[PDB]
Copies of this chain bind each other. A is one copy, B any other.
Amino acid sequence: TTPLVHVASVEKGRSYEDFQKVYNAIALKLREDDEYDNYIGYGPVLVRLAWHISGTWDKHDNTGGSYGGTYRFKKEFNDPSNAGLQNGFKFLEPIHKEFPWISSGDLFSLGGVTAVQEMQGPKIPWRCGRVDTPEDTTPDNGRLPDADKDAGYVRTFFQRLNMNDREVVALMGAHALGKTHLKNSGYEGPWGAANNVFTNEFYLNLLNEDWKLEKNDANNEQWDSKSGYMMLPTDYSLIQDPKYLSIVKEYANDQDKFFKDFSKAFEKLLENGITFPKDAPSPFIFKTLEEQGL
């Protein structure tokens, strides 16, 4: 037999130079559309978008993931878990018009890689070849994680994504970016002060801020600090669990280790479910706008 296999197929006649141009298109628009969400910018929502299209993967039957680009379809687009991500889809729509040859999954995942790098995060190797799949391939709602949970839920959820403790804690450091919006998720507030620069501030705030459980205006409980930051129940679980806590202290102490571990976990997340052929090109590492004098 053979369960469903998603074989990567490079876009016809496209090479590294072509994707660097798409990276540049996204990266320049991130610079010019800097008013979004009280001058946070589109950086954080593009990272969340790339994670939400990848986070639907199920290792047990190989369904979901970023390969098929199915977030463009109604069922996934209107998932309650994806509330707010419409701003990321509309951000990428004109870029897709400029480069109509790129697949939906490639552009979504490339948006997240561009955003992390352009927010001064680590370099993320990126592989092309995702192929848009029919609408029936869209995973049903409910594969994405609920915030209102503890550490055991987080650990068991990410096993479905073939992620271990170190990969989980590292991927969760992306909450240094952006904020929660009450209208989107039922939670309100930023995780930190530098929420459009990729740093290890998430782990520092977890460990250095006094947190108090409090109900928000949506009747959800969240951890709040006097300085105005917040943590989701699933974030705060990373310091309630002893094996998670040791990794939080590791990344709080060494940002470079966090950078290396996040780059591997994030690329793995973006590539879950994709079978790459034997003759597939090596991952691309795109130059930033700054490295190009822009």
Contacts and interface: CB of A to CB of B under 8 A. Distances in A.
A242 B60 contact: no
Interface string A114-141: 0000000000000000000000000000
Interface in A23-63: 58-61
Contact of A2 (B60, B186, B220, B242): B242
A283 interface: no
B221 A186 contact: no
A73 interface: no
Interface string A260-283: 000000000000000000000000
Contacts of A186: 156
Interface residues of A, number: 28
Interface in A142-181: 148, 150, 152-153, 156-157, 159-160
A221 B240 CA distance: 24
Total identical chains: 2
Nearest to A63: B213
A213 B1 contact: no
B156 A218 contact: yes
B60 A219 contact: no
A160 B1 contact: no
Nearest to A242: B1
Contacts of A153: 219
Contact of A221 (B148, B160, B213, B241): B160
A233 interface: yes
A245 interface: yes
Given A1-B240, A58-B213, A239-B1, A159 B148 contact: yes
A3 interface: yes
Contact of A245 (B1, B157, B242): B1
Nearest to A236: B60
A65 to B, nearest CB: 15
A2 B242 CA distance: 7
A219 B143 CA distance: 12
A3 B213 CA distance: 14
B240 A3 contact: yes
A2 B219 CA distance: 27
A59 B160 contact: no
Interface of A: 1-3, 58-61, 148, 150, 152-153, 156-157, 159-160, 186, 213, 218-221, 233, 236, 239-242, 245
